[PDB]
């Protein structure tokens, strides 16, 4: 009935300095379907993608996020969201390695 | 093995506001939506036309559009007349496997309330009180009983034939993974953590673990394969281990695409 949501952040691509690529951030297993998800650049959005909203089995619920971002050893990155099972807004952190 | 599927979204904030997305999934690749907004469907790809002539798609798209309109205007009535509270959240999933195996189904609240058996709609078995008032309604009305034997009996095995034929390329495509390692956070005292990143890769299948030679290691964890906007995947595995037992350790990648030829990393210092 309420599923609170799973938060993962990785690249599509091998991280190089330098090197355009793209940031995913992908949520999934939760329930209900409405819900917030940013991805961030030193705190600041910056624009993404969304796929349509789809679902498994077990009736939870996931979407893939992901923006066109280019690392560098200096900025991070992050992924924000917000969903009513959530008293307070869940950063999940892209690690690098 | 390419199952298909249909999928529902509806939801209803309060009586003033409501939406209702659909999408489909031939294996894994997604040749239709239904946005709320769109009073069509989207052919996502070039062979999502299948063989169907456009005389069967027009009529296919009316059924589906009557439906989605009707649809809506059920529940809000079903909510006034059995008082059930907002918000709600309905979802339901059709599709066939070709053996020929058809299912409706439908969730409530996020958990399987009702479904479609024979000519008739069943209540799970542990569905609330007042969805037995909602079969009763709807074992009814005996035009739309026949409209969905149809469609999961007629519709569903034609099209899902035909789409398979016309995407059967796209559909058993082979796409090389790339690999990196790194290391991550340190999990304790000593304690090293051996990352082994996957991406790109397709179909889904794929066996991903770390080594000593040939001896296979275990205390490897697996991560959830996750999707890429591309409709490739992504898979991270881990190891922890030892700063003394660093020693030779390699991360070995198995995927239909490589046939025999594994991708082989290893770690250095
Ligand atoms: C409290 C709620 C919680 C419970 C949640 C679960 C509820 C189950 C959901 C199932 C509800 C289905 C309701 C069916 C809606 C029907 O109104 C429509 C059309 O009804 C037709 O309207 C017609 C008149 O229309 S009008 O001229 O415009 O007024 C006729 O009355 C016709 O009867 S007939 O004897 O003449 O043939 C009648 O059936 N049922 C359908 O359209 C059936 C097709 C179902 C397609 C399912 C596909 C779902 C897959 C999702 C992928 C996008
Ligand atoms: C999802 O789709 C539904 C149905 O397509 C949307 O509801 C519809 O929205 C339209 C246009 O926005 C509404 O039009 C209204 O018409 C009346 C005329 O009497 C007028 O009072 C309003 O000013 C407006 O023009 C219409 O009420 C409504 N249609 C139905 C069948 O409910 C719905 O908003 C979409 N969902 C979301 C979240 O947008
Ligand atoms: C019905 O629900 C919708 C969606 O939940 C409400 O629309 C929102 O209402 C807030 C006010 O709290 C406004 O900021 C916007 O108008 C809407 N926001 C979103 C995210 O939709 C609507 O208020 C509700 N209608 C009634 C009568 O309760």
Redesign the pocket.
Request: aromatic share 16%.
């Given at each position: 009935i309420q599923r609170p949501p799973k938060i993962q952040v990785y690249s599509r691509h091998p991280p190089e300095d330098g090197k355009p690529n793209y940031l995913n951030c992908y949520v999934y297993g939760f329930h209900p379907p409405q819900i917030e998800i940013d991805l961030l650049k030193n705190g600041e959005k910056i624009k993404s993608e969304q796929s349509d909203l789809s679902f498994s089995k077990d009736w939870s619920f996931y979407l893939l996020s992901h923006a066109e971002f280019t690392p560098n050893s200096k900025d991070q990155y992050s992924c924000r969201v917000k969903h009513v099972t959530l008293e307070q807004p869940r950063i999940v952190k892209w690690d690098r390695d | 093995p390419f199952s298909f599927q249909?999928?529902?979204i509806s939801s209803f904030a309060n009586r003033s506001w409501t939406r209702t997305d659909?999408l489909?999934w031939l294996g894994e690749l997604q040749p239709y939506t239904?946005r709320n907004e769109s009073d069509t469907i989207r052919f996502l790809k070039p062979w999502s036309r299948g063989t169907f002539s456009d005389q069967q798609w027009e009529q296919l798209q009316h059924?589906?559009l009557?439906?989605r309109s009707?649809?809506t205007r059920?529940?809000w009535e079903?909510?006034e007349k059995?008082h059930?509270e907002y918000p709600?959240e309905?979802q339901?999933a059709?599709g066939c496997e070709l053996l020929s195996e058809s299912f409706?189904r439908?969730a409530?609240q996020g958990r399987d309330?009702?479904s479609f058996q024979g000519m008739s709609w069943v209540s799970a078995p542990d569905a609330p009180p007042?969805?037995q008032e909602?079969i009763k309604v709807?074992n009814q009305?005996?035009?739309?009983k026949?409209?969905?034997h149809w469609?999961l009996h007629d519709i569903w095995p034609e099209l899902v034939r035909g789409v398979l034929q016309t995407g059967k390329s796209e559909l058993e495509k082979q796409v090389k993974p790339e690999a990196w390692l790194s290391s991550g956070p340190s999990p304790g005292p000593g304690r090293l953590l051996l990352v082994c990143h996957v991406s790109g890769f397709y179909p889904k299948p794929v066996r991903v673990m770390w080594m000593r030679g040939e001896q296979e290691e275990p205390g490897t964890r697996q991560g959830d394969v996750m999707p890429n906007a591309d409709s490739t995947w992504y898979l991270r595995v881990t190891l922890d281990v030892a700063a003394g037992e660093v020693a030779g350790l390699s991360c070995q990648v198995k995927h239909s695409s490589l046939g025999d030829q594994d991708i082989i990393l290893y770690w250095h210092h």
């Open positions: - | 249909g999928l529902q659909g489909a239904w059924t589906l009557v439906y009707s649809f059920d529940i079903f909510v059995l059930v709600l309905i339901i059709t409706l439908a409530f309330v009702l007042f969805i909602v709807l009305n005996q035009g739309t026949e409209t969905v469609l």
